[PDB]
Amino acid sequence: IEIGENVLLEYIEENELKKAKSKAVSIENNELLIAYPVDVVTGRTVILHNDMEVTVEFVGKDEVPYRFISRIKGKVKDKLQMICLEMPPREKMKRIQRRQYVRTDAVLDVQIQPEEEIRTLSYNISAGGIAVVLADGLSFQSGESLRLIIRLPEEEHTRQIETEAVVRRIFNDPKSEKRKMTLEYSEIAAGDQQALLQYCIRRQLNKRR
């Protein structure tokens, strides 16, 4: 559970599966109150018809994602229109895991090249994707295929991993006002990917104690 966190809904309206993003207000007794149901892609608000079985997703205080089916109990009026969601038990609230590959926060040398060539740094990495800090002026696009070269330092032997990856998303970090960008490996060698895989596990393992 948490408060103020994002509550992601997934319902069926007019035979197609629509998703929406709301905000946790309170979880009094067995009822969850969410506010401002806006569409996941459309910034404009939406309407959740009562008694509609929805599928609620959220990230708890343990940085673990949770998913449960529920129902629109009804509207609640106190100063705004908030939607009442019937909460399940504490069982029947399945913890999910959407990442195929284990991620680790590592500042690695990344070289992006589509005009010239951009040598930059990553801020987290995975065996299937990468997230990289951009400088101002760099113009890319979600869906553009880029060739990037990753300097993976597997101890003394510095492995150079060359892949092609497609831009997932570009956003502005509210903590640094610097552009960040994420990519998914379009094509990566089996040898390099396995090494990159064992690197992220050991690196994540080396900080448990």
Ligand X SMILES: Nc1nc2c(ncn2[C@@H]2O[C@@H]3COP(=O)(O)O[C@H]4[C@@H](O)[C@H](n5cnc6c(=O)[nH]c(N)nc65)O[C@@H]4COP(=O)(O)O[C@H]3[C@H]2O)c(=O)[nH]1
What are the structure tokens assigned to 134, written together? 């951009």
Return the closest-CA partner of residue 7 out of 27, 37, 30, 28: 37
Q: Which residues pair with 9 in a beta bridge?
A: 20
- Here the tokens at position 8 are 């992601």
Binding footprint of ligand X on the chain (CB under 6 A): 6, 59, 63, 65, 97-101, 103, 124-126, 128-131, 168, 182, 184
In whole angstroms, what is the distance from residue 54 CA to residue 127 CA?
33
Whose Cβ is closer to ligand X: residue 6's or residue 42's? 6
Smaller CB separation from ligand X, 84 or 130: 130
Task: Report angle CA 29, 34, 36 to the nearest 5 degrees.
Answer: 165
Residue 130 C-beta: closest distance to ligand X, Å: 5
Minimum CB separation of residue 128 from ligand X in Å reads: 3
Q: CB-wise, 8 or 76, nearer to ligand X?
A: 8
Of 33 and 132, the one with the shorter C-beta distance to ligand X is 132
CB nearest ligand X: which residue?
A: 129
Please, what is the minimum distance in Å from the beta carbon of residue 185 to ligand X? 7
Q: Report the amino acid identity of residue 5.
A: E
- Closest contact distance (angstroms) between CB of 132 and ligand X is 9
Are 178 and 172 in contact by the 8 Å Cβ rule? The answer is yes
